[PDB]
Amino acid sequence: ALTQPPSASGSPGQSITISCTGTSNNFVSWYQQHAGKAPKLVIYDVNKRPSGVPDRFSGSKSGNTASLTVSGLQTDDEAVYYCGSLVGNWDVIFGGGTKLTVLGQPKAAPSVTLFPPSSEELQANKATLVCLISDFYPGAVTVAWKADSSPVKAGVETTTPSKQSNNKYAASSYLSLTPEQWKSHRSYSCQVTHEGSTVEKTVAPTE
Amino acid sequence: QPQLQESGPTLVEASETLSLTCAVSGDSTAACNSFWGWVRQPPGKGLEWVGSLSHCASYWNRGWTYHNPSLKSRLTLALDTPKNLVFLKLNSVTAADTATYYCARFGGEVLRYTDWPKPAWVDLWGRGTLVTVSSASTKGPSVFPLAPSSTSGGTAALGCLVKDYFPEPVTVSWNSGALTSGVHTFPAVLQSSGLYSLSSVVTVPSSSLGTQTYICNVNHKPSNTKVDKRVEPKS
Ligand SMILES: OC[C@H]1O[C@H](O[C@@H]2[C@@H](OC[C@H]3O[C@H](OC[C@H]4O[C@H](O)[C@@H](O)[C@@H](O[C@H]5O[C@H](CO)[C@@H](O)[C@H](O)[C@@H]5O[C@H]5O[C@H](CO)[C@@H](O)[C@H](O)[C@@H]5O[C@H]5O[C@H](CO)[C@@H](O)[C@H](O)[C@@H]5O)[C@@H]4O)[C@@H](O)[C@@H](O)[C@@H]3O)O[C@H](CO)[C@@H](O)[C@@H]2O)[C@@H](O)[C@@H](O)[C@@H]1O
């Protein structure tokens, strides 16, 4: 599989490189996807540009690592970038995508509020933990959940960050549990990773 | 420049068949320069290759058809070159098939090749069509309070959990629109049950929790439902 970092950022006019490991051949491509729009091919065959793609986009490859470089970032370059490749005889796979932010305001750490299941929802025989994340920039976070100290993967739904009225970003994440498993642990935690920082909030049924 | 335009149903019940048509303009599906196929993208996730095909035969076949191995047992691709149409058929859909489906033209070592053509990259994308897999019927939401504590430096977050409605959209206001500052309503999540949920949150001064009433107003026009839910501090 192809591995991309979740996000990267630079200021207008700077140069930035994002990488993609696992490319074992020269059938490498890169795609630009603006929010709400279809992807667009910007690099093919490691370093070829389709007609109309500015020369400030350039591709390269070293070992099993392909790289896309954008010289002189413009605000229009803000998008999610995917690497693609041929694998096996004739299969196509894509990387997980890198959210590239062109910095237009100070970076801001997120505020995290973790709501336990409401009494009303528990009386309807359901239990949902609500982790609300707000006031961060760039608009890219990783959310992980823990029961006591053990990581939890099943029952998690997370929204893509969307802009607030103050133009910072917010996101939400949900952990769906039965009332029994909510009562059976000592605590639950929502961990939000943003840039080089992780914020964790904890709730307990005995609160 | 060439254009790809998808069409077909955007709501498919679970276990049923998902069928999509793509109309190609400005290029020939009968020419041998490209493969034609599909890429999909679940909401909020990455790109996933579906497959592609070509009707340009070698001397030992009638064409080429490549499938994503995890979809092959359910997947059928087709071309109608006189009408310049690309087809997708996917049986027994589950929630994991909810995605934006993109019609796609593939390039690579296609016109000339050794051993077999290698369509490796998508050089032309359709606009995409979001197909939702859900057996749900129209259903109004259940609204639950996200109560504040009697939270962080003089201000308190509180909100509403809008659960298990169908279809979209739901709109949320606070205090019949009298409270807008510090309000944020989040995008909906499609749960594995086939129903949507979202949350709305507002930050207010903690000193107001005892004197000011906070009510979220949830409007679900598809079911002609409105819900006002009083959000009161925890006890
Ligand atoms: O990237 C795909 C796959 O690659 C790796 O897995 C290996 C792969 O090996 C396939 C095969 O390759 C080599 O043979 C090459 C070809 O030689 C001959 O011309 C002929 O035998 C070919 O057979 C095809 O054609 C005949 C007649 O035309 C058909 O009757 C027959 O069913 C074959 O048809 C398939 O292949 C053609 C292209 O060759 C397609 O156009 C056609 O639509 C059909 O494709 C379907 O089935 C494929 C599986 O066979 C599948 O990949 C497609 O997506 C589609 O569903 C012959 O192909 C030799 O090395 C030979 O020994 C190999 O078997 O597939 C094997 C099974 O998966 C696997 O064991 C090999 O290791 C892996 O990377 C894998 O993960 C990846 O998906």
Residue numbers in the entry:
A (entry chain L): 3 to 9, 11 to 27, 30 to 95, 95A, 96 to 106, 106A, 107 to 210
B (entry chain H): 1 to 35, 35A, 35B, 36 to 52, 52A, 52B, 52C, 52D, ...
What does the paper say about this structure?
Among the specificities that perhaps have garnered the greatest interest are bnAbs targeting a conserved patch of oligomannose-type glycans on the gp120 outer domain of the HIV-1 envelope spike (Env). PGT128 and related antibodies bind conserved glycans within the oligomannose patch on HIV-1 and exhibit broad neutralizing activity, and thus are of significance to vaccine design efforts. We focused on incorporating a D3-arm-like extension because the D3 arm, along with the D1 arm, are known to be important for the interaction of PGT128 and related bnAbs with oligomannose. Here we demonstrate the design and synthesis of a series of related mimetics of oligomannose based on a bacterial oligosaccharide template and show that a single prime plus boost immunization with one of these mimetics, in the form of a glycoconjugate, evokes antibodies that can neutralize a subset of HIV strains.
From the results above it was clear that neoglycosides with the 1-6-linked D3-arm extension were reasonable mimics of oligomannose. We therefore determined the crystal structure of PGT128 in complex with glycoside NIT68A, the α anomer of synthetic Rv3 with the 1-6-linked D3-like arm extension, at 2.27 Å resolution to gain insight into the full extent and nature of this mimicry. NIT68A was chosen because it bound PGT128 somewhat better than NIT68B. We found NIT68A to be well ordered in the crystal structure, except for the linker, and convincing electron density is present for both branches, including the entire D3-like arm extension. The structures are notably similar in the equivalent portions of the ligands and in the Fab backbone conformation. Superimposition of the putative common ligand moieties gives a root mean squared deviation (RMSD) for all atoms of 0.22 Å (0.20 Å for the D3-like arm alone), emphasizing the strong resemblance between the oligomannose mimetic and Man9 in the context of PGT128 binding. In addition, remarkable conservation of hydrogen bonds observed in PGT128 binding to NIT68A further supports the antigenic mimicry of mammalian oligomannose by NIT68A. We then synthesized two mannopentaosides (NIT59A and NIT59B) equivalent to the Rv3 oligosaccharide backbone and a set of four mannoheptaosides (NIT68A, NIT68B, NIT70A, and NIT70B) that incorporate D3-arm-like extensions. We found that none of the soluble glycosides inhibited antibody binding to NIT82B as efficiently as the NIT82B conjugate itself, suggesting that the antibodies, as IgG, are interacting bivalently with the glycosides on NIT82B. We further present the crystal structure at 2.3 Å resolution of PGT128 in complex with the lead mimetic and illustrate that, as a neoglycoconjugate, the mimetic can prime for antibodies with HIV-neutralizing activity in transgenic rats harboring an unarranged human immunoglobulin (Ig) repertoire.
